[PDB]
Every structure is written in C-alpha cells, then in structure tokens.
C-alpha cells in the first residue's frame, strides 16, 4: 500500500486534445463585428459607446497565456488553466470582458445603473 495519499489517477488520450493552434493579432474588426461583440457581452452600443470601445478591444483580445481550450471525453469543448490546474465551461477572456463592462458601467453610472 501507499502508506499515505494515493496517485492512482485516471488517464485517456481523448482528454489530451488541445484546440489552441492559430491566432491573428494585427487584423482590424468591422463596425458590424464590434457591434456583434457589444450586443453579445450585454451592451446597448447605440447609447453606451464607452462600453463599445471596450467591445472593440474585446473581439481582438486572446486568452491569458495560462488558459487554452481542450476536448472533454464526453464529446464536448471546455477551457483549462495549465498553471493553476483549473477548468472553465465558458471562455476566460469573454467572462472577464462581461465583468469588465459591468464594472465600467457601474463606475460611469456612479452606482446608479439601470
């Protein structure tokens, strides 16, 4: 026996399929694509153009250097942090941009947001 903590962890090859491969940094998004990320992250860009400067940077921004997508053995896609050893079911940068929009909106509205 191990006479302490056991290391008999499960293994699979389907759990090794990482989806991070290509990304472009220099491309410029169209106004229709900036409006699409603004509407997707919860913004009304017709009345909230500050939160849409946030969305312009939003659509071009990549994931942090420790986080990347991978395949789960049930046949599904998820996100994993390789420095902390943590999983997520939504994009870490997308969840960050929603939180950043909400906090910027609360500051611009001086806690009187609607």
């Amino acid at each position: 026996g191990p006479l302490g903590s056991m290391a008999g962890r499960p293994l699979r090859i389907g759990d090794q399929l990482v989806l991070e491969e290509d990304y472009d940094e220099t491309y410029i998004p169209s106004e229709q694509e900036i409006l699409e990320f603004a509407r997707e992250i919860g913004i009304d860009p017709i009345k909230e153009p500050e939160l849409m400067w946030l969305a312009r940077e939003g659509i071009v921004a990549p994931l942090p250097g420790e986080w990347k997508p991978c395949q789960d053995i049930t046949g599904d896609i998820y996100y994993f942090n390789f420095a902390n050893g943590q999983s997520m079911w939504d994009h870490p940068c997308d969840e960050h941009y929603r939180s950043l929009v909400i906090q910027e909106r609360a500051k611009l509205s001086t806690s009187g947001a609607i």
Side-chain angles (χ1 to χ4, degrees):
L3 201 69
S5 302
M6 185 54 180
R9 66 207 179 280
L11 294 174
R12 212 56 47 99
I13 305 306
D15 189 66
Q16 315 304 320
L17 180 56
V18 171
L19 274 72
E20 181 269 293
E21 172 171 86
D22 182 60
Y23 166 75
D24 191 287
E25 196 181 87
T26 209
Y27 93 96
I28 278 58
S30 183
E31 187 175 87
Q32 188 176 2
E33 302 179 289
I34 298 167
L35 286 169
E36 187 174 87
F37 188 63
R39 290 167 182 159
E40 173 54 48
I41 73 194
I43 314 182
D44 180 15
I46 301 176
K47 302 298 181 70
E48 305 179 321
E50 301 77 10
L51 309 183
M52 110 174 287
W53 85 244
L54 250 178
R56 180 190 67 206
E57 268 67 281
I59 192 164
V60 299
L63 297 182
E66 62 194 79
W67 284 102
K68 56 185 73 189
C70 191
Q71 185 175 101
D72 179 277
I73 194 58
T74 60
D76 192 27
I77 304 305
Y78 82 103
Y79 295 88
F80 195 73
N81 186 327
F82 292 70
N84 190 254
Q86 180 59 56
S87 56
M88 268 291 288
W89 308 115
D90 291 282
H91 339 57
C93 195
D94 182 82
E95 288 285 276
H96 152 95
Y97 264 100
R98 291 171 198 276
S99 302
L100 192 66
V101 165
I102 277 154
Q103 286 173 5
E104 183 72 276
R105 188 174 195 266
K107 181 61 175 181
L108 292 176
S109 308
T110 57
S111 308
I114 187 62

